């Protein structure tokens, strides 16, 4: 199995510098280019710059958007990628990707990573408050129950969200977070037959890396 | 430089039918070396990555269904999808590879699908936040097509505007639905003062407005 993984996304102010990295397995690492490609958030993606392979010397290009300013570099006995960026912008918010390139052959970008988002901004960290959402004095014996999460009052972006551990991924909804006052706010629901609520357990997983907040809520009727 | 631009910026087809769309290049991408066009298209559905369709123009990488079909040649390039598939939302890109690398800006497919009716519910705020001082009520709008509604709530009757944030999600990849939250924030002192919190969906499907309501004194 072919995996990328980047790492090292998080808020920085502007004019400071970050390093990511993109771990990577199931190929032969020093074979292939390395691209680096960015997209901020509901925005097209752009390329960065490549690190070519162990036959090209693994020398580098960029893009002229970067050239001068970010570095890329490989550790080709642990086969992992580097990003190091400098003089950060507002203009650099963005989800940051490593994707397999060339390998000598093919034209194609063949895997890209999960991403990893890089927020620009003098704002603080502040982690999320979080809220059950659970029925009022509704009917309830409308056949399903929707119960949800309220994760509000947070900064930078992201966070996750889970139900159960990942057991209930059919029938959530997760609300893009939408940005006030310096501070996000989104909300999850969750549809489950009423036989199941709250007979059985029903619990949002919300984690906020920046803040390494963990919290596991519990929907309790009432 | 080599300019990417693609058309439509974004369109709707219903399951079944054919998606056209279409990648420019300010320059051939053709190699005369290799004699094949250095353009490959990307697909990225809502959350994810991109993933690899096609490559060299017209060559579909293994596991992509075969509904996805690439073709054209030097500056002009088409992406074409035969019976569209609810799953197949997701924005297109396309990307030279002749000379460094360069995306377009994309091509947004949505799925239109029959009108449906938002499932509404409403929330009263948490002790947990009423404890800090704040109240903030929520009201879902889960399945509805298409993505147009106005929300409004009604404290004690009267309309309020104010300290209020809708969200929309994504088309639903299965069933081409979209959902809705809103949210209103008051103080816990403002809170208290009122007691029927009430949101009412209006939506195409029906004149009639969904209305869902709490009163606080039956908490
Ligand atoms: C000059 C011909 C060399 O061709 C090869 C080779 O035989 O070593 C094979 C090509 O596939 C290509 O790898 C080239 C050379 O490394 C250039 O490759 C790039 C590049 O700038 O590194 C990258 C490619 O994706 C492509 O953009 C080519 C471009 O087509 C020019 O050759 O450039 O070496
Ligand atoms: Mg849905
Ligand atoms: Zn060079």
């Known amino acids: 199995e072919v995996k990328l993984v980047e790492s090292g996304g998080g808020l920085v102010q502007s004019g400071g510098s970050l390093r990511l990295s993109c771990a990577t397995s199931?190929?032969?690492?020093?074979?292939?280019?390395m691209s680096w490609v960015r997209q901020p958030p509901g925005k097209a993606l752009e390329w960065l710059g490549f690190?070519?392979?162990?036959?090209?010397?693994?020398?580098?290009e960029y893009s002229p958007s970067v050239k001068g300013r970010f570095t890329i570099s490989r550790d080709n006995s642990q086969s992992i990628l580097y990003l190091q960026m400098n003089t950060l912008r507002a203009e650099d918010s963005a989800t940051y990707y490593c994707?397999?390139?060339?390998?000598?052959?093919?034209?194609?970008?063949?895997?890209w990573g999960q991403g990893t988002l890089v927020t620009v901004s003098a704002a603080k960290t502040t982690p999320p408050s979080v809220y059950p959402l659970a029925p009022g004095s509704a009917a309830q014996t409308n056949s399903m129950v929707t119960l949800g999460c309220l994760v509000k009052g947070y900064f930078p972006e992201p966070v996750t969200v889970t139900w159960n551990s990942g057991s209930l991924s059919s029938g959530v909804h997760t609300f893009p977070a939408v940005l006030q006052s310096d501070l996000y706010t989104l909300s999850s629901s969750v549809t489950v037959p009423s036989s199941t609520w709250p007979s059985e357990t029903v619990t949002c997983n919300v984690a906020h890396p920046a803040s390494s907040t963990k919290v596991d809520k519990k929907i309790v009727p009432r | 430089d080599i300019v990417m631009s693609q058309s439509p910026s974004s369109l709707a087809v219903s399951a079944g039918e054919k998606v056209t769309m279409s990648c420019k290049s300010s320059?051939?991408?053709?190699?005369?070396?290799?004699?094949?066009?250095?353009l490959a298209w990307y697909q990225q559905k809502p959350g994810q990555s991109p993933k690899l369709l096609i490559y060299?123009?017209?060559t579909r990488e293994s596991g992509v269904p075969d509904r996805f079909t690439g073709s054209g040649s030097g500056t002009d390039f088409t992406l074409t999808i035969t019976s569209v598939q609810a799953e197949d939302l997701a924005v297109y890109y396309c990307?030279?590879?002749?000379?460094?690398?360069?995306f377009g800006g994309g091509t947004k497919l949505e799925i239109k699908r029959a009108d449906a009716a938002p499932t509404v519910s409403i929330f009263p705020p948490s002790s947990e936040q009423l404890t800090s001082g704040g109240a903030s009520v929520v009201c879902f709008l889960n399945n509805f097509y298409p993505k147009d509604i106005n929300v409004k709530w009604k404290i004690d009757g009267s309309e309020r505007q104010n300290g209020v944030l809708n969200s929309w999600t994504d088309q639903d990849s299965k069933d081409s639905t979209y959902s809705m939250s809103s949210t209103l924030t008051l103080t816990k002192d403002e809170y208290e003062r009122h007691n029927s919190y009430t949101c009412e969906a209006t939506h195409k499907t029906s004149t009639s407005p969904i209305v869902k309501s709490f009163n606080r004194n039956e908490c």
């Open positions: 990307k030279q590879s002749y000379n460094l690398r360069t």
């Open positions: 994707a397999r390139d060339h390998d000598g052959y093919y034209e194609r970008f063949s895997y």
């Open positions: 690190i070519r392979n162990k036959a090209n010397g693994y020398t580098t």
């Open positions: 320059q051939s991408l053709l190699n005369s070396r290799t004699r094949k066009n250095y």
């Open positions: 060299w123009a017209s």
């Open positions: 199931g190929f032969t690492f020093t074979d292939y280019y």
